[model samples]
Target: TLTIYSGRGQSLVEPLVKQFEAETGIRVQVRYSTDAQILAALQEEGSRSPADLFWANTAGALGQASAKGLLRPLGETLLEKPIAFVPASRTWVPVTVRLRVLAYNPDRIKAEELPESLLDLPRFAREKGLVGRVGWTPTYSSFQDMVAGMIALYGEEKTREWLLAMKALAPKAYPSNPAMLDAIRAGEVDLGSTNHYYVVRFRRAGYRLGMHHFRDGDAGNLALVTGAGLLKTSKNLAAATRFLTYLLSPQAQQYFVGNIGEYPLVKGVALDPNLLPLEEALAKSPKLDLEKLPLDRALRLLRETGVL
Candidate 1:
């Protein structure tokens, strides 16, 4: 039996995990929660943690875990993304990619009215007299990672400036992506920034909202990865490694894209017809070193800018 500490929601990962168990004859037990909660629990347990694997929803959390020496190196031979989805330490491997996108109420804002770049959003909101109608999540880890990626791609001074401009708009703040999505659904906000997956969820539920992809490889097109790592304390090292490999297998890769609307990381896996091809999405995004993102610095900037 292999024990897994999964930051991915149970509903999202349960079926795939069960399939892995059935194929490999390895009984799997999973504990599911947010990445933050699982990280806290793993830290609390230290080397005594029974978690053989740490399945995460964001690269930032995986990087954080790797920094804490809680993860075992998985070595190389993983697929390449337009950006380096894996950490520099090779402690984790990406399973899928989620692009950052702008979700808008078509009834409230027109297609041409959307900002061409993430940096222009604040100015666009102000000019359109929609300041408080923009929704954002200041404390969300994925949002922090996007900011951190911006800080990496753009300098701190410029990133800080953009963040200050956004803060000045006093956007309707939400606790999570779903909250912002709901606000857009209810027509309470003209626009909200979130991962493409959330927009898919809303669309699947029959919402009439529209999703806009920023032009010119802007930060709004940042690609965030959902991935997993093996724990150093795992007693089932072989089983754990096999499970991680299984996640990258063609069947599992197809399962992820078909069921969750995520872009598969492994090459040659067919993506859902509803999603933009991974290659096209990558071409439209800014080049980023996912491992080099300064999450702590980004959080500090968010604090200093009074968003947190």
Candidate 2:
């Protein structure tokens, strides 16, 4: 039995853990939290926390944990080839993935008319007014992570400008990804930036929404990955580590990519019918380095920009 503290959301990982338990004959004790809370608790608990494993939805939190020495380095044997965007020495491993994308109402704007980059949202809002509302998970640590990466990639000046644009332009901010999807489905906003699987899940459920994957110059390259990692502290360290290995196993990832409408991280793992392969994703943009994303820096920048 291993106690795993997961920030990937109960909706996504519980089933996988159950299946893992059934197959491995191991007991899994999971404590679920939003991304920020998990990281904060880990920071607070430090060496004293009862948690043995830390699975997060965003790299920002994982990076934060790694930077703070809150996690233990893992072996490469737990992963497949090309290493689905996690840093070497394995502070944590990435399991499931999503890209930063804009979901839009086709009725309001054609595909050609939507903003191609996250940076365009500010200008889009200014030009279109309330018609171009932006939405994302403000309370979720994943959003904070995304904002942090933006700051690192674009620098403070540009990142702050983007944050100001988001604050000034956004008329509504939802608490989570599902909320953003709900608002978009109800037409509360014209377009939103979110992971593509959220849109895919709803669309399969028969919602009237469309997803636009942003590409640097072509289609099929925009994606942000939601990831998982086992912490260094745990009563059941072997079980926790085994669970990490299991997630990337063919059988497990197949379930993740199939049932969840997500792109798999394992090399040569087939993608879901509803999604594109990771190779196509890389071809679309050569610079999706989640390992290099500085989540903490982004948080500070957002605060300076007044988006927080």
Candidate 3:
């Protein structure tokens, strides 16, 4: 029996986990939460935590977990041959990637008025009746991972200003990505920032909307990756490691790209049709160093910026 603690979208990961169990004959248990809550729980439980693994979609959260010593170092072979999931130094390995993008209601706003860069958001929000009020999911770990990237690129002062400006500009804030999508489709806001695939999911479900990748070098246009790592408290270390190795293998990576529109983390793996490959997005974003992201700093900054 294997137990894993995961804080990710249920629909996105459930299929992958089911496939893993069927093929490996490993019985697994999954519990879902926002990324921060899971990390808080593990920190509270310390060595007595029941979770043998922690898989999160936000690289920044995984980096925080690794820094807290909540994750154990993976075996050497897993690191060397795979080129590591999140670079050579980090303990967590990436399973997939997500790009932050704009979702807009074309009916409410003409396509030409849309900003070409993410920073152009503030100007739109300031003007009344601009693309539906900007939509956001502040608590989603991947959103936070984007903030981490912002902090890295802009430093604390400027990043704090950006978050505050966004919060003030947004008249509506949803609890999660799906809700954000619903609001946009309902015309509650004209435009939103979210993972590109969420818009695709709704489009497939027959929603009326349009999506645009934030071009012109916006950090919000940056990519955040999903990853898995071993928990220090796990009794099933061997199984957990094996499962992670299986996840990053080219075979398993492609199996998922076929089922979901997830962008691949495994080198040379083809992207599923549901996603736009980064090769077209631009030169691949320098992968974010989630380990270097300081969550406390980010959290405090977000709150101060009024994004909370």
**Estimated TM-score for each candidate:** 0.86, 0.83, 0.80
- What lDDT score goes with residue 147 in model 3? 76
Candidate 2: tens digits of C-alpha lDDT, residues 142-256: 5665675665556778768777767877457787788888887777887776777788888888887877766563212334566666666666778777887887788777787
Q: For model 2, state the Cα shift of residue 234 in Å.
A: 4.2
- Candidate 1 has a TM-score of 0.86
Residue range 1-308, candidate 3, lDDT tens digits: 67878877788778777988999899989988878899889989998998988888677678788878888877667765443345454577777766787888888767777777666677776774553377888887667767777777678887777776776664577898889889888877777788777876787788877877665456767766678888988999888988888878887777656556566665757655556654554343434554666667777787776677
lDDT of 1: 0.84
Q: After best superposition, candidate 2 residue 217: deviation in angstroms?
A: 8.7
Off by over 4 Å in 3: 9-11, 31-34, 45-50, 75-85, 107-113, 125-132, 167-170, 249-255, 258-260, 267-270, 279-287
**Maximum-TM-score candidate:** 1
The residue-level lDDT of candidate 3 at 195 comes to 79
lDDT of each: 0.84, 0.71, 0.74
How far out, in Å, is residue 31 in model 3?
4.1
Q: Against the true structure, whose lDDT is highest?
A: 1
